[PDB]
Design an enzyme around this catalytic site. Structure first.
Site, PDB file in Angstrom:
ATOM      1  N   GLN A  72      89.050   8.785  -8.062  1.00  9.03           N
ATOM      2  CA  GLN A  72      90.481   8.587  -8.181  1.00  9.03           C
ATOM      3  C   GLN A  72      90.882   7.298  -7.467  1.00  9.03           C
ATOM      4  O   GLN A  72      90.042   6.527  -7.001  1.00  9.03           O
ATOM      5  CB  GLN A  72      91.232   9.789  -7.592  1.00  9.03           C
ATOM      6  N   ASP A 126      90.430   4.733 -12.262  1.00  6.58           N
ATOM      7  CA  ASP A 126      89.927   4.040 -13.453  1.00  6.58           C
ATOM      8  C   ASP A 126      89.925   2.512 -13.350  1.00  6.58           C
ATOM      9  O   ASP A 126      89.990   1.784 -14.348  1.00  6.58           O
ATOM     10  CB  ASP A 126      90.620   4.574 -14.721  1.00  6.58           C
ATOM     11  N   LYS A 178      85.171   1.742 -10.746  1.00  5.13           N
ATOM     12  CA  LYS A 178      84.185   2.193  -9.736  1.00  5.13           C
ATOM     13  C   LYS A 178      82.758   2.492 -10.205  1.00  5.13           C
ATOM     14  O   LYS A 178      81.808   1.945  -9.651  1.00  5.13           O
ATOM     15  CB  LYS A 178      84.720   3.420  -9.012  1.00  5.13           C
ATOM     16  N   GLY A 186      86.236  10.576 -13.808  1.00  2.00           N
ATOM     17  CA  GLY A 186      85.602  10.211 -15.073  1.00  2.00           C
ATOM     18  C   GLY A 186      85.089   8.793 -14.954  1.00  2.00           C
ATOM     19  O   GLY A 186      85.865   7.847 -14.971  1.00  2.00           O
ATOM     20  N   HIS A 187      83.787   8.649 -14.771  1.00  5.90           N
ATOM     21  CA  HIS A 187      83.212   7.331 -14.622  1.00  5.90           C
ATOM     22  C   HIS A 187      82.371   6.913 -15.844  1.00  5.90           C
ATOM     23  O   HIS A 187      81.734   7.739 -16.491  1.00  5.90           O
ATOM     24  CB  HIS A 187      82.431   7.245 -13.302  1.00  5.90           C
TER      25      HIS A 187
END
Ligand SMILES: Nc1nc2c(ncn2[C@@H]2O[C@H](COP(=O)(O)OP(=O)(O)O)[C@@H](O)[C@H]2O)c(=O)[nH]1
Ligand SMILES: Nc1nc2c(ncn2[C@@H]2O[C@H](COP(=O)(O)OP(=O)(O)O)[C@@H](O)[C@H]2O)c(=O)[nH]1
Ligand SMILES: O=P(O)(O)OC[C@H]1O[C@@H](n2cnc3c(SP(=O)(O)O)[nH+]cnc32)[C@H](O)[C@@H]1O
Ligand SMILES: O=P(O)(O)OC[C@H]1O[C@@H](n2cnc3c(SP(=O)(O)O)[nH+]cnc32)[C@H](O)[C@@H]1O
Ligand SMILES: O=CN(O)CC(=O)O
Ligand SMILES: O=CN(O)CC(=O)O
Ligand SMILES: [Mg+2]
Ligand SMILES: [Mg+2]
Lengths: 431, 431
Positions: free
Chosen positions: A224, A13, A16, A40-41
């Protein structure tokens, strides 16, 4: 360089997604090499917001081809879910998504096991995302998992399917005394889409090899962070994949001498979601700020994230495993208005020793404490600033400090969520 | 270059051990990055023979430091066994072996499961070495395995130990209806040596980083071959590790931009031990020769190896995933006295298509057949020849052909088992 890699230098987080989308203006392929739909982007463009999980951040540019490499553990359910909700926003996902027939499949049983295990451990839960990533990977290394390629033959497949759920069921019921997953259903849903999946199939290792004989631009997109690496991370509180830079060659099929520039994403402060060691963790008010202001909530689980100060010793680690060529500082703006900032510069061990090298395993981090360094902050604000010039002296002062301490340049400064709110001092491609 | 890597370009047993020992004359560290004591290497010096399995091929030079990286799955039993029988030959193993506290441990239960599984599959056994490498790795990715670092604390350890065998026992008995492993014994044997293991412990990722700020010479030593890569190999007939070049960064901790030269070992003909796809496999007389003459028998299981012709399409694959800088041809001498030689140059698919790119999974190789090319051999002999000059025209002709077909140079030619019986046209280090 031509083969650029973007990955989290911390516990994920760091930012990215954003960066991968901003950088793909000039690239042809974008490759996801590990993880699942646990990543989760969040990409924001003129306010419009998009959160991808399995599909690469390059999905919105129509000049880039997004490839899902063999590193990734593909859930037929997740893809479908994601694909459909994007096509509804005018994005022709199918016209531009390709994948590896070697990706292992995540099916309901994995989820079952993943969640059943978490319960088995109780007081020591890892705090995984509950997406069945672990089991999906295990079966892979246990040589019994199902890949994208085995959806091709459907007779052959159901035998295999029948074989692995049998064994998985046996443990689900007898052992955890949980509920069993029905083979008939799993079989159907998968079968429901086998053809859609199977049409996206491509020979990734080879194409990437083509891309290169040409000097095509290829962006590798991490999932990650570094301290989540299954080998190099704070075991056992890690993800099941090599999130570090070697994950690229194993997960995509591109030879290691072809990685040209590795850019590491750096968040300016620290967050960790899930359980595990975290020295500079802020339990006080300052924690609440960083969390409030930096809208720190999981992008996949909606779980609040732990915040703490930037840890220079952990980061010195990621420079090292990652052979980072350069950093991309994100969320500096989230620091406007603090009286002063601080950064972990060394670790005080449980036996009195002042060290500057991280332990490497949960239990071994147990008693360590952070020896911070204190810096004047800034009441002036930096949010949305597009040029070095608009950044106040305390900021630039903070910025050069990090470089000093790490010996790695800060090529991109990020001052907000919208694509455009960035500052590129050096583009990774033409470097 | 400074960071050289040696790995099998095929199904293993190409000759890695030899080469690693011959090359370490000029190197400071030698790192094993994956596998276990399933690797079987054979070094010969003035006839005296040594077969290492877990300990690196650099153990006999006293100028090199042998490191066992975090990629490796360390069996306390195997190390001890090996270490002791070498110290008895005057080699001070302890004065020169270091290892990663992050290596996962192989304990009897793994062996139990590995062997029980093989039986469960029956008609489809992988033909593993029975060393429990699979399970040792699974537990790793399942986040429940025991590492070298957890031998440190002994109270903490037995709890953990108690936790994983419980679950493993449950399946061993109830499920396979096999015998259970006793926790008390496993606990003892390990405890018997924890201190010896724990004294060799080192921070590998960091030291390698030191080695480099200095330009120290570091040789990376592969295990198994390329078509055994868990991701890129003929799944499910593969090993559980990334034997390909990316295994180095994940398994040792060295950043990918530091790999300077990757040398691939090439056997001149083909062997495969264990079960799985093998197009150019020789079931006829010529098979018997290559096997007789080339003393082809497992180095770990004593199992006879399958032999067949050199397959240029498979190899074109390893050049690609591996970003090989150069090859090292071994066992040419094993070809003296044949009327003619042949090499697989393309694949004829089950539907009539002539392809030059390998399938990638067991089932997908099912019906493919080899389109060989035929070359005059040589009745003159080459065994023990130390110079290009002594090699007959048919040989050199065979040699340049391979280069043509692959586009990769042949830097070292090997004409026999003794260290000295080699021909180095270009040393990987000063290249
Ligand atoms: N304020 C602020 N938010 C940012 C910045 N860069 C990115 N973000 C946003 O912060 C979040 C980072 O979380 P996440 O998307 O999960 O990152 P990921 O792990 O790289 O995918 C998302 O809201 C981003 O759009 C920045 O520089 N400033
Ligand atoms: N005749 C012959 N034997 C060789 C040559 N190079 C190596 N060998 C020997 O052949 C064998 C190769 O098998 P192995 O040791 O298992 O290879 P590894 O997988 O790389 O460890 C050993 O006997 C070597 O010493 C060579 O050029 N000629
Ligand atoms: O096994 P999983 O489900 O991956 O979770 C194990 C640990 O991985 C951590 N985890 C997994 N993915 C993430 C991400 S996603 P992104 O950075 O790719 O956007 N972020 C933070 N923790 C994660 C999780 O919080 C838990 O601590
Ligand atoms: O799971 P393991 O025990 O590694 O075996 C699975 C497959 O790996 C194959 N295998 C494992 N190691 C080797 C080696 S050792 P070396 O090349 O490092 O010297 N060689 C050949 N097959 C191997 C084995 O024959 C079986 O086909
Ligand atoms: O962006 C990734 N997330 O933090 C994962 C999660 O919330 O589980
Ligand atoms: O040299 C490695 N061997 O062939 C492994 C084995 O025989 O099992
Ligand atoms: Mg995220
Ligand atoms: Mg061998």
């Amino acid at each position: 360089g031509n083969n650029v890699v973007v990955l989290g230098t911390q516990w994920g987080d760091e930012g990215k997604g954003k960066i991968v989308d901003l950088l793909t203006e000039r690239a042809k392929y974008v490759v996801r090499y590990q993880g699942g739909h646990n990543a989760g982007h969040t990409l924001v463009i003129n306010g419009e917001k998009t959160v991808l999980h399995l599909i690469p951040s390059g999905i919105l540019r129509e000049n880039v081809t997004s490839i899902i490499g063999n590193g990734v553990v593909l859930s037929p359910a997740a893809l479908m879910k994601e694909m459909k909700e994007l096509e509804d926003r005018g994005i022709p996902v199918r016209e531009r998504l390709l994948l590896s027939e070697a990706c292992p499949l995540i099916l309901d049983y994995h989820v079952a096991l993943d969640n059943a295990r978490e319960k088995a451990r109780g007081a020591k839960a890892i705090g995984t995302t509950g997406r069945g990533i672990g089991p999906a990977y295990e079966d892979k290394v246990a040589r019994r998992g199902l890949r994208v390629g085995d959806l091709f033959d459907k007779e052959t497949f159901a035998e295999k399917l029948k074989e692995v759920m049998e064994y998985h069921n046996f443990q689900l019921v007898n052992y955890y005394k949980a509920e069993a997953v029905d083979y008939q259903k799993v079989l159907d849903d998968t079968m429901a889409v086998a053809d859609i999946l199977t049409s996206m199939v491509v020979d990734v290792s080879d194409l990437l090899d083509q891309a290169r004989q040409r000097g095509d631009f290829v962006m590798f997109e991490g999932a990650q962070g570094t301290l989540l690496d299954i080998d190099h991370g704070t075991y056992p509180y890690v993800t099941s994949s090599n999130t570090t830079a070697g994950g690229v060659a194993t997960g995509s099929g591109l030879g290691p001498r072809y990685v040209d520039y590795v850019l590491g994403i750096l968040k300016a402060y620290s967050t960790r979601v899930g359980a595990g060691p975290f020295p500079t963790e802020l339990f006080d008010e300052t924690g609440e700020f960083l969390c409030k202001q930096g809208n720190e909530f999981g992008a996949t689980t909606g779980r609040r994230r732990r915040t703490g100060w930037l840890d220079t010793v952990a980061v010195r680690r990621a420079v090292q495993l990652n052979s980072l060529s350069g950093f991309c500082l994100t969320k500096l703006d989230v620091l406007d208005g603090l009286k002063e900032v601080k950064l972990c510069v060394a670790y005080r061990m449980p036996d009195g020793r002042e060290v500057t090298t991280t332990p490497l395993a949960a239990d071994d981090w147990k008693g360590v404490e952070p020896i911070y360094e204190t810096m004047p902050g800034w009441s002036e604000s930096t949010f949305g600033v597009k040029d070095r010039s608009g950044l106040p002296q305390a900021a630039l002062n903070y910025i050069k400090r990090i470089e000093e301490l790490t010996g790695v340049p800060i090529d991109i400064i990020s001052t907000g969520p919208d694509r455009t709110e960035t500052m590129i001092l050096r583009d990774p491609f033409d470097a």
